């Protein structure tokens, strides 16, 4: 859609402020620390049939999840779809590729910070976010060895 | 859903002769796919990652290829020390990542610590602990497996840096991996005889798009957890 | 268009070995040095038509325009596409600003290389580019200060 | 696709201290690629705006450039004696489509060298080359630009070569002028002239953008070489007696 294209190539689109973040409080974090798309795609979708199962449960990470997955679906679809015309899967598997290496991480990074909100809780996140990027910000002199670790809720 | 077919389940050489492994991939998983060796009473050791490349110490005379749905380990100049049980980890996802069946292959001529495994009743609980030491658990992931007595590798679940949990479809319900600064643990429910097994806990290192359930090392000595009616 | 696609995004084709030279040898050029795109565009299709007015002197250089042609053709068709059926023309705006930004310079190097060798002749740009390349890498206290200049042909 | 600048107002009178206007409409969108020049009688255009806004560099705060697309503006607010000048604006939309307006005459009330060569007189019907001698520029990275002003009237842009010595003409020029280049040099030969030729002849170098075009931003400039067509001369050429 128009949002789509907005956040993914160039413009002025921080999808974070709405929730009280911002996109260099995630640009903070090393990539390892991320799942793949696809990983993060199927919890994703779990989390969204859940809020379709049951109503009261829906949220704005919700509808942001939709949409970050109908994007994805998106560039997937348009990838499919040049290995029509142009007669042959590599053709599709380079676009894809380009996706990937282009656009994955920040797909990554979206993906990730409404899940956690969802399954942390919002604050617990945006809390671990300014942790991470003062332990990353800090001098290496006097920061600790470990940058701060996200723990699970107690059940 | 992914199931690997490994073949042969046992093979015979000479010191000298060449050992061929093959493992069928039910999926395409591209080049995500380990090689592992096992050594009687030992924990498992990663020979090769990403199908092909070699991990540092691992003699020329092993081999890894293909990608997609077909991947052979051979050893060509195989050696006494070779002797050893071998098992392809291959992962479509985190969630659909399964161990080969192993090859039992007969020759003739930084720090993770598990903790917790005892005697446990039927139908009991139990909680698991593996403490870190050396790895920064923000940026490296930390995988289960187990291993039935006198039985190939099975893997349970991993959990990333970014502390999402992913478990394979069997464990889904009975098994929970947690994470505090520390430590990951794990805790099972509903314990049956077939969850008698070492519990080894081992740590992913993630590829460019972040798969780290194929890629493990170092591993953990392990934990016995015996489910008996005698307590 | 398959081509196309492998030369823009791909970074497995060296469009410029069949003609005798590399991709290394046109990155040394400053991007100051190639006109804009649109500008490449018109000398090109002019070209073209002397190709077809004339198709005693068709090239390979004239083919090689050609499909360079297309190809941006394609990139615009595309960037239209979006926009038409999104609601917006600045979705298309987007696109085309995404497509001059990556790969423009690209295209201003093969472009300019094809119509230069139309111009002053193959041998001469080949030779040019080389002596731009020993200037680039030369320690600057041992070379001019001006690099080497491509003069037009008398 | 041709390209016209309108400029208005042709003339404007203000006391010292007033607010100047100057209006510039494309007759297609150009972007930002847009200069506003200052020329002062007997003198060479000066570069003041690039990029539709942007100063260059001693210019006063008191001039100010904007607008996009279609429509531009150059406003002198603080307007002093100093600024009494024609200003022309200078659209590209691609560097064949470039052009000037037609000039503003404002009145107010209380290393790097060109060397333009080669104006003479010459007969109708004949042909000339002009030098541009180019120093402390780099030719393969800065292009260089014919511009020609007839007596008492405006600034014409007549072409362009980049660095990499592909030239450009506007459509008028095309076919009876001919731009080359040297290592020290860029030429401009010119062929079947008449009255209307007759003009002082400037080179300037353009400097590109990041798209690569550079026929609207003209810094620095020449004094130019003045041609003269004159049937009083035989079919030779005669130097500025």
């Known amino acids: 859609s128009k949002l789509c294209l907005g956040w993914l190539w160039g413009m002025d689109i921080d999808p974070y402020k709405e929730f009280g973040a911002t996109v260099e409080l995630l640009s903070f974090l090393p990539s390892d620390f991320f799942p793949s798309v696809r990983d993060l795609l199927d919890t994703a979708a779990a989390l969204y049939r859940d809020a379709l199962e049951s109503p009261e449960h829906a949220s704005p990470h919700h509808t942001a999840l939709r949409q970050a997955i109908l994007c994805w679906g998106d560039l997937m679809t348009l990838a499919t779809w040049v290995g029509t015309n142009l007669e042959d899967p590599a053709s599709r598997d380079l676009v894809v590729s380009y996706v990937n290496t282009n656009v994955g991480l920040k797909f990554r990074q979206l993906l990730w910070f409404h899940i956690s909100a969802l399954t942390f809780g919002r604050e617990t996140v945006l809390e671990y976010l300014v942790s991470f990027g003062v332990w990353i910000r800090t001098p290496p002199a006097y920061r600790p060895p470990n940058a701060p670790i996200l723990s699970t809720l107690p059940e | ?231």
């Open chain 2, 1 to 231: 859903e992914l199931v690997l077919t490994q073949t042969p389940s046992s093979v015979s050489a000479a010191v000298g002769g060449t050992v061929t492994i093959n493992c069928q991939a039910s999926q395409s998983i591209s080049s995500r796919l380990g090689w592992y060796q096992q050594k009687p009473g030992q924990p498992p050791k990663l020979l090769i990652y990403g199908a092909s490349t070699l991990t540092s110490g691992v003699p020329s005379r092993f081999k890894g290829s293909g990608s997609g749905t077909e991947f052979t380990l051979t050893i060509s100049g195989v050696q006494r020390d070779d002797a050893a049980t071998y098992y392809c980890l291959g992962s479509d996802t985190s969630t659909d990542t399964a161990f080969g069946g192993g090859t039992e292959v007969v020759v003739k001529g930084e720090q993770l610590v598990e903790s917790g495994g005892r005697l446990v009743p039927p139908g009991g609980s139990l909680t698991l602990t593996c403490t870190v030491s050396g790895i920064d658990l923000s940026s490296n992931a930390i995988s289960w497996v187990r291993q039935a007595p006198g039985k190939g590798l099975e893997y349970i679940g991993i959990i990333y840096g970014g502390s999402i949990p992913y478990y394979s479809r069997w464990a889904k319900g009975r098994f929970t991996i947690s994470k505090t600064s520390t430590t990951v643990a794990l805790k099972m429910s509903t314990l049956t005889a077939s969850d008698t097994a070492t519990y080894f806990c081992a740590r992913g290192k993630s590829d460019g798009d972040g798969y780290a359930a194929y890629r493990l090392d170092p591993w953990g000595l392990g934990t016995l957890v015996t489910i008996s009616s005698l307590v």
